[PDB]
Amino acid sequence: EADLTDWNLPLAFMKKRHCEKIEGSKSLAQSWRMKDRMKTVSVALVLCLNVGVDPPDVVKTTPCARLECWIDPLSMGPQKALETIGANLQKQYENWQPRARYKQSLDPTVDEVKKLCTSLRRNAKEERVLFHYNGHGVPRPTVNGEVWVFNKNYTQYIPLSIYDLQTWMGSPSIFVYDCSNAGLIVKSFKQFALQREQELEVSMKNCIQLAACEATELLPMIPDLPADLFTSCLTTPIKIALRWFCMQKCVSLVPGVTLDLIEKIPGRLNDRRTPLGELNWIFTAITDTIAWNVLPRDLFQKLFRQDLLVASLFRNFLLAERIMRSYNCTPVSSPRLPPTYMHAMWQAWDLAVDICLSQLPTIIEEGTAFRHSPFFAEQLTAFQVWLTMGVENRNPPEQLPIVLQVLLSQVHRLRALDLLGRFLDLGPWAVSLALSVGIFPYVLKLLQSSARELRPLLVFIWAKILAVDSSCQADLVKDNGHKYFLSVLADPYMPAEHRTMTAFILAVIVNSYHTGQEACLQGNLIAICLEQLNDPHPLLRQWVAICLGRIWQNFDSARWCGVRDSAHEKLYSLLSDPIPEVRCAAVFALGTFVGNSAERTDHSTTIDHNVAMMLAQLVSDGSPMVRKELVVALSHLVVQYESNFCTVALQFISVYTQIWRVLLHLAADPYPEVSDVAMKVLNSIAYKGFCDWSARYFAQPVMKIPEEHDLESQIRKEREWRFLRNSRVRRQAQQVIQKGITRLDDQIFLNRNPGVPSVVKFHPFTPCIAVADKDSICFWDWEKGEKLDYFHNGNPRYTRVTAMEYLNGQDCSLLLTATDDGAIRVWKNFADLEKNPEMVTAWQGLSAGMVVDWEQETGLLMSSGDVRIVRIWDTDREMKVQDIPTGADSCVTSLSCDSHRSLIVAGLGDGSIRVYDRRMALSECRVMTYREHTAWVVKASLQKRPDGHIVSVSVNGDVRIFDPRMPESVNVLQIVKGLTALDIHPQADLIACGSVNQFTAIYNSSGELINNIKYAISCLAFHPHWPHLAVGSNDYYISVYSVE
């Protein structure tokens, strides 16, 4: 049942589900646009300490090691001390920002400070300036933040207040306070700034501050640590970190590790292969990880992205917090951060350090080669394990700032790029995250990399970025970029998928950037496009055509070059592609070609005229995308041809006449949107898209697993149960047939019709009673008889419904409703009609009423009969029509085809049925003339039985059955006498005739007629599977007759 009932039978408007997705997408927040670029320019080194002078505030002890900058020459005397310490602070600050302007001041007083601040302001006024106070060897600051200058005499003190410095330091600035009670200074500074801002109402928000510890506590004295512990932590993190690590571990699990080895570690701290550089590399990764994972976005960008020096200082500040906590000191800063020293990531740091030190013996000692750490490999492993389920409704990975910096090396770069690509399958969500974290300028720099093996990854990455960040204003194009992708597409050996992605990238570059529309001409993209038209890949041909069109847009020279290489003719040869999408691309490109002709005329107007004709023939196409893009392209043509339609429009109200015919045919098409747009174009002239979908495709996830490949999917179960229902309904009908059939003396259905039951049709399963009036299709529930809603067909006043059919015998078919004027209105939404009456579409079947017969197992649809000919539409490809010129002389009939062969039957004409096999040549159309019905024939049809006789009805009522191979061999019954129609049921011994009076007549194949069944007649309809007869009476009721 369901094993075979689930046929491989697609619906003719299945592709509509994809074709009507004419939509765009959304943009991004684009927080990466760091419009604030305020850099730091200069630094001031205020070394207020006086060597050898012990303030009264302090009482030292024997282990007061007073190292500052790791250098304690109290032996050498004061002058050497000051010189050396100043030089070392210079050298240390240069390690983080060499390019600044450094000014030193050792034991300043007042005018020195004023002059220094004035010079700093003169040098720059918007760029930040760094300032820091030492602040050792001076008394403790007051409640006013007063700071004791000395006049080369410790008794000659001057307490400079905060206000003088604020006045002197007006520009943006960073302050660092290595005092004892520095938090007091920060607090008083903020109060003073509030007072200054209040006076300005009669500088805040332009000031960063870092403080050693809280106002109510003093710096500690430790025998082993430097006195300038906070400064060293902010300035030289590695040395103090390792030294603290060796001093602080409660139980040492690595014997042999000692400070002598720590003071001899080989490296540079700027070479990732060396030990110390690797240790910096790990340190930087970990600290950025914590900072990104604990803060909100804006604070993160302000502290870690606007400026290099600020980012470095806060990166070290986190370590400063960790170390200071163990000695009862809480560092203090401008805008406060959450507490961070419980974060799990710190454990990783410790482990990493151990591993390096675990091999530091026997490297220094014996020269054994250094081994590299497994840290980044493990982090990549964790990121991959998160990807393997990759749900987006939860937290993002914690390791993303780590892979960002793994990209910057040249060891793991391929694997990181692969994992980033997988992360960017994926949705706009992942794109937004990976954009916000950064990454993209580094990829822009990788575009210039010489490694061609990086090509397929980068393309794919960019293929997603531009797919989401469509508004990107081509920073890649500025640094070549477009040329790189031109060379990429120039490769024929690259896979067709990557060629298609590169074509899309070039298309977006040309679309979204005018200098891109120039660079495409600079590199000769038109020739490459015309070369790439020779590929079976559909999307590649579409993007080739779209690139050509966009190139031709807004440049006359491009249009001239397209003429020069006969680009338009090669594009015209693309119109032989069965795929509607590629032909839409060709239509768009040709319309743009003519539109950008600029009305230069010369000889090329002929070419333009040809291009109009090149599209005109496509009115014969029934494909909806093609029709819509044809009316759009015709708008792109008439934008120029309206210069001369001012005269020609009177014909509608050579080339121009054919354009009027084209636009009127598109107006006459039953499809609503095509007709409406064509009428708009016609009105606009007379008074005087797919590209979005194609770009939308790439941003969708790739490597999707269909829902129907999930075995436990609800779709599979629902389909199986529906097909079992349909199969069992058909099996019940088969049981009725096999058990024997009596006269249909029982009733199933009897209900009012609001109007004429002109046509009656049903399903080959649970047969929802569909009946057509002149201008509507009304439905009734068959098993119960409940009346349902109706679809109003919008038919003209001179138009009836002449036939109906379905597009599937097993699945959710779309009911076709064929009307007098050649139109067919289509919808599957009769299913759950009470809930979803939204009909689908309409189209033109014709160009005896109208009748349609769908060939279910071939994908064709045969159409009749207002024309004298037979029209064979194909719906599984380019929606064209084959015109078969039969020998009929008038409107022909309801056609039928015995699917075993290409046999067609036709005729209501001059006394003959015309039957022919289409395999013969379709210019003779040899037809078996069945002349026994010399009268006006009625309802020529085939038996679907193996016997295959020809059924015939006369206008006079004669009913006859011809042998297909012998017109002379016939069986004659002549049953329709006082009766209105005929309807044989080939699966049963039942043939209905209706009546002219208030009854119904049925007869068996032997001719045995009854005329007394009551449960004139417009319509008779046997169910396609049940041996039950439906009577669409002329009293505007409907009734179903059943076997007893």
Binding site: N270, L308, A311, Q405, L408, S409, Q410, P441, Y442, K445, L446, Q448, S449
Partner: peptide, 8 residues
């Protein structure tokens, strides 16, 4: 421009 000394 870059905050880090990248290897291209």
């Amino acid at each position: 421009e870059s905050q880090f000394e990248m290897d291209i």
